[PDB]
Design a protein around this nucleic acid. Structure first.
Lengths: 140, 64, 50, 97, 140, 185, 65, 100, 71
RNA sequence: GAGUGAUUUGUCUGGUUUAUUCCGAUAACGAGCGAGACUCUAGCCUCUAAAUAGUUGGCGAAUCUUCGGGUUCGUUAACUUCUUAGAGGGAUAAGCGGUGUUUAGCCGCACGAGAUUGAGCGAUAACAGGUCUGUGAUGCCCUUAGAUGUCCGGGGCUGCACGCGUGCUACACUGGUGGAGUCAGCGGGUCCUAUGCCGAAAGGUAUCGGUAAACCGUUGAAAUUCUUCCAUGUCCGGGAUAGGGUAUUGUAAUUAUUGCCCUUAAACGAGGAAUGCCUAGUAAGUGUGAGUCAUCAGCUCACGUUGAUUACGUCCCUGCCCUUUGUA
RNA sequence: UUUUUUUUUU
């Protein structure tokens, strides 16, 4: 009766499972510089997890399940406080290359479509199918 | 605070002296009466006048 | 190079390539301090009345 | 996720080889602290005492050519155009008379 | 179609609860009540159910839509809307005796479950950093 | 009506206040039996309204001090939750009862005022207010620049205070005030 | 060493102290056959019905003028 | 078609008077009239220092101008518009007609 | 005096962890660190091993605090 | 009325009130300004309306499903609960108990959304207070072309042994670092910029839409929540100072405009004598918008989010108001 | 408990 959509499960578990699925599928081509870059100006160090790309793409797909968006919107979604040293913190957007490439890979796996109005990306016909399957797998 | 100014007190005295019959011991009745018997430029002022009129009625009943 | 008041004569050596002319004609004079005056410090603002 | 003590010597040799030849191991030129050297033009990462040696050479170069930045450097003042009226005071209070 | 619509408020957060005849569902913005952040403030959402009894909720479908404010304010608005929706349902389709009982339990536990807290931010006044505080005064 | 348990774990109806003077100033049971110590209520509109605030909520309120931690009531509630778990796991009895005993023992019963000082008695409300203030102050100091976490420090302070041992910060300060006041009699 | 005496506040005489911080009250001993009623100075907010715990009960406060 | 009547003013009373007059005209001509839709008011705030110099306590003057906007939707292809729009008019209110 | 606190388990301390610590009523990284003079990170790493082996029970597993008890 | 007069009385013994607010007494009677009333604002609730706001359905479609349901778009009716903004009601010391001079009123209770929400305005008489550098406001004085007018080119207003004021960032596990997950409001725009593509970033590039409840924008803010590593070490706290490279604004960036990348990594271990602000959605923490703005916010003016400890007093310090009194 | 001063003219 329950646990038939992504909205009925824990979002942390949902992203973990989606990342696991993306890694297992073996169809996601990670950027060469994955182990070489920060994920935005506000960050000080590179990601601790070497597989951060899969988690980031999983989070992108999970949020696309909730609302359509674009690269600019996701830059704010993953942006945050930047510490300017001896000056007060301010909001800073995240990097855009990682977001773009992750969404392009999600398109390659036929999980994301272009908005029919041509103003962003939307979770695709197969994307909803797969994400609901992962959610109902989480079940419990 | 809750001390009524001379504006309210004088208006209440004139109203009681001129419309004693219509003034009962009920605040809503006094308010409705004032609405038509006087032109008051503010609802808070009208309510203050009506309340003091009722308070004066309560004493009038006891004595002069 | 004009420094605002006078033309500082300067030979151009090969080691000055890639810099501005103004970097070689200082516009001010280095400060040598001078035994602070009356206004400095809060103690030394009082003038006797008589 | 390992303590440096649990590493052997050839691990450090590998790391040091990478550090001295970052360009060989696909470390982009924008990752290095000395790119397009003013004298040699080579792009590399200064390490150990090389950093201090290069700092000395840079200051000496500017001072010798009498660049404003070098003059300020060897005068001991701030060189990035900060206000020096109120901050940076590391001296002794001087009284009046 | 047996349906009522109530609302709860707190600070700026406002929640609108639509409670119809159903099989015992409660969904906030499409998510279950057990996965609403912050985690620690989940017993606050469960409190109406705990006090009244899940048996008096299992006959309705309450869909809540909340917006404005912050996390804590939205939690409080949601719980208030839930309580008011149940009371309104029992008032419009169940006996006044049961409605009175429901109001009695809710008011005995917490008054804010039914009556909105009227506190709102006070405007800042010049000469100080906030509503009441003033900038430091130097007397010399 | 179901029994209300703090955090859904600790029973309130089994808590008793030894001090008759503080029975009506330490709200624990009956109307004060609340599931969470986070209730966004107005306890300062009138003079003695704060006396109706649940004691656990007062603890959480007083733990969010030193502006670094100002306004973080969720973190403070989590801290009290973990401290209560440590209390139960270490002593064996109801952590709410432990807190009540600590509050009973931590409040001074005689103080000094500037009327050189003059010894005066302490009203029950102030006795409770200082009890909470001293306990939270002791935990905060113990956890600063220390490996022990704030929850662990809070647990130790409550345990020692409840036992009356002169190792808790609050008990030491309480005895200090009474001793000084006894001199100014 | 005087026994801990519990006393209920029968009435509040009024505020006192240099800054008006203390409260002069009248207290009546709880466990006392004669019902000793005296005047005390109290620190902190106190109201009628509050039970104070006097470490020593012999002292009496000077009545307010 | 949908004729849009946009009436904007800085004073509520004249604006509502004109709006009521237009609504009454349309109803009298038995037209399909859509009630007055009230757009959120626009508040323009200028906060300035009162002093013309830099001296004294720092006191600020808070000026604000309010703009109220009313929408009226009409299904009127006949020239009844011309009449209803021409008769009603009042200073301080600016009305505009659009062929949406 | 600085806390000369070890980063990895010496053998004697490792055996102490399996013998004494498992009997403590309250088991937390801070207390075991103060007992065996071990970095708190090591303390909780080893407590994870103890939990995996089943000699301790987790009671609180917050990111800001972990609490274990004797089994 | 009282005094020759300066001047008094009115404008009070007393009680009360935030209040020269009222009751009352009264050689004064009758009035005015100020206070109050008033305007805006915050609640909570009922009539008007909503293809620039939305709901409840109905109807298509596509996912999962424990088969009974959940989620999701794309859309023609009923309705305004939510949204917007007009019109109204609503609270007043009116009801009950106590108290008080049969008053003015005060305390508590009840009813209630609320039993003092915050601002604006704000008298007589003054200050040698600030402003001639806001002004085609201005007297007098000075100057008027080897100018104190005006423009053009450079420099300075930032210059640094030092003293002071307002501040920002911190000194750490109530934490920092990498993830994951989520909630605003005031308001701005011809300039905002969606959205594609490139770039590690900064940013670049083709342009949609919008002069706006229509688009930016469901304004996906921070603090906060959950996880991972770090553990009392000046260290993964702090990020000053400095080197190199690098985008962008602009005629021009040197005396570094600002931002980005790598590197260097200082004092600081809770701060003496002193001293400021503050009573509830307040303090404090936290970010956002606007002003300034070609570029540049650590400033101010506002807005929200998280949200307390203490007191509900006193005249002891600092002052203020009224009366009596003394005064060279 | 202690608590001294305040240039000339205007």
């Amino acid at each position: 009766t329950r646990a038939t959509s992504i909205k009925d499960v824990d979002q942390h578990e949902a992203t973990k499972s989606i990342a696991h699925f993306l890694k297992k599928s073996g169809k996601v081509k990670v950027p060469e510089w994955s182990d070489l870059v920060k994920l935005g100006v506000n960050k000080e160090l590179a990601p601790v997890d070497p597989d951060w790309f899969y988690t980031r793409a999983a989070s992108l797909a999970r949020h696309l399940y909730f609302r359509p968006a674009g690269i600019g919107a996701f830059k704010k979604v993953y942006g945050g406080n930047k510490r300017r040293g001896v000056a007060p913190n301010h909001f800073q957007t995240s990097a855009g290359n990682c977001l773009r490439k992750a969404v392009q890979q999600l398109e390659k796996i036929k999980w994301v479509e272009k908005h029919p109005d041509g103003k962003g990306r939307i979770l695709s016909k197969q994307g909803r199918k797969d994400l609901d399957r992962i959610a109902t797998s989480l079940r419990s | 605070s809750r001390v009524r100014t001379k504006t309210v007190k004088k208006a209440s005295r004139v109203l009681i002296e001129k419309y004693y019959t219509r003034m009962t011991n009920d605040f809503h009745n006094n308010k409705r009466v004032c609405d038509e018997v006087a032109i008051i430029g503010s609802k808070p002022l009208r309510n203050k006048i009506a309340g003091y009129i009722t308070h004066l009625m309560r004493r009038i009943e006891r004595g002069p | 190079i004009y420094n605002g008041k006078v033309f500082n004569q300067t030979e151009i050596k090969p080691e000055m390539i890639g810099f501005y002319l103004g970097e070689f004609a200082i516009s001010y004079k280095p400060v040598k301090h001078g035994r602070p005056g009356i206004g400095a410090t809060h103690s030394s603002r009082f003038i006797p009345l008589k | 996720n390992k303590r440096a003590g649990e590493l052997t010597e050839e691990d450090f040799d590998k790391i040091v080889t990478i550090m001295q030849n970052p360009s060989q191991y696909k470390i982009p030129n924008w990752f290095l602290n000395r790119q397009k050297d003013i004298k040699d033009g080579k792009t590399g990462q200064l390490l150990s005492t090389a950093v201090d040696n290069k700092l000395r050479e840079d200051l000496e170069r500017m001072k010798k050519i009498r660049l404003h930045r070098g003059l300020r450097h060897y005068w001991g003042l701030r060189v990035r155009g900060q206000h020096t009226k109120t901050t940076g005071r590391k001296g002794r209070t001087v009284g009046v008379s | 179609v047996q349906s009522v619509q109530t609302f709860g408020r707190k600070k700026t957060a406002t929640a609108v609860a639509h409670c119809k005849k159903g099989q015992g569902l409660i969904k906030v913005n499409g998510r279950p009540l057990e996965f609403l952040e912050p985690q620690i403030l989940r017993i606050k959402l469960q409190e109406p159910l705990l006090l009244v009894g899940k048996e008096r909720f299992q006959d309705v479908d309450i869909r809540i839509r909340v917006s404005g404010g912050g996390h804590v304010a939205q939690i409080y608005a949601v719980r208030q809307a839930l309580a008011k929706a149940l009371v309104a349902y029992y008032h419009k389709y169940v006996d006044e005796q049961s409605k009175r009982e429901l109001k009695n339990i809710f008011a005995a536990y917490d008054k804010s479950l039914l009556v909105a807290d009227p506190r709102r931010r006070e405007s800042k006044k010049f000469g100080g950093p906030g509503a009441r505080a003033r900038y430091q005064k130097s007397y010399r | 009506a179901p029994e209300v348990a703090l955090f859904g774990k600790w029973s309130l109806q089994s808590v008793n206040v030894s001090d008759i003077s503080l029975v009506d100033y330490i709200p624990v049971k009956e109307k004060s039996a609340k599931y969470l110590p986070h209730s966004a209520g107005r306890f300062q509109v009138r003079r003695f309204r704060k006396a109706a605030c649940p004691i656990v909520e007062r603890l959480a309120n007083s733990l969010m001090m030193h502006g670094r931690n100002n306004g973080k009531k969720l973190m403070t509630v989590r801290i009290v939750k973990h401290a209560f778990e440590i209390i139960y796991l270490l002593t064996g009895e109801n952590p709410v009862q432990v807190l009540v005993n600590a509050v009973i023992n931590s409040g001074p019963r005689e103080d000094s005022t500037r009327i050189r000082r003059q010894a005066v008695d302490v009203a029950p409300l102030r006795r409770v207010n200082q009890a909470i203030w001293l306990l939270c102050t002791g935990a905060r100091e113990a956890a600063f620049r220390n490996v022990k976490t704030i929850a662990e420090c809070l647990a130790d302070e409550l345990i020692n205070a409840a036992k009356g041992s002169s190792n808790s910060y609050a008990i030491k300060k309480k005895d200090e005030l009474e001793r000084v006041a006894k001199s100014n009699r | 060493m005087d026994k801990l005496t519990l006393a209920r506040v029968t009435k509040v005489i009024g505020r006192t102290g240099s800054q008006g911080q203390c409260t002069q009250v009248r207290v009546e001993f709880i466990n006392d056959q004669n019902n000793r009623s005296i005047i005390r100075n109290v620190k902190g907010p106190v109201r009628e019905g509050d039970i104070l715990t006097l470490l020593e009960s012999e002292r009496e406060a000077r009545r307010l003028r | 078609h949908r004729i849009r009547l946009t009436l904007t003013s800085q004073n509520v009373k004249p604006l509502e008077k004109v709006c009521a007059q237009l609504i009454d005209g349309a109803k009298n001509e038995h037209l399909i009239v859509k009630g007055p839709i009230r757009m959120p008011t626009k508040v323009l705030r200028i906060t300035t220092r009162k002093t013309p110099c830099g001296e004294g306590s720092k006191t600020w003057d808070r000026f604000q101008m309010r703009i109220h906007k009313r929408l009226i939707n009409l299904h009127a292809p006949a020239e009844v518009l011309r009449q209803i729009t021409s008769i009603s008019i009042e200073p301080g209110v600016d009305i505009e007609v659009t062929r949406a | 005096d600085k806390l000369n606190n070890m980063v990895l388990f010496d053998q004697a301390t490792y055996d102490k962890l399996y013998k004494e610590v498992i009997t403590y009523k309250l088991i937390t990284p801070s207390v075991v660190s103060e007992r065996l003079k071990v970095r708190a990170s090591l303390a909780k790493a080893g407590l994870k091993e103890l939990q995996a082996k089943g000699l301790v029970k987790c009671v609180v597993h917050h990111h800001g605090q972990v609490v274990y008890t004797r089994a």
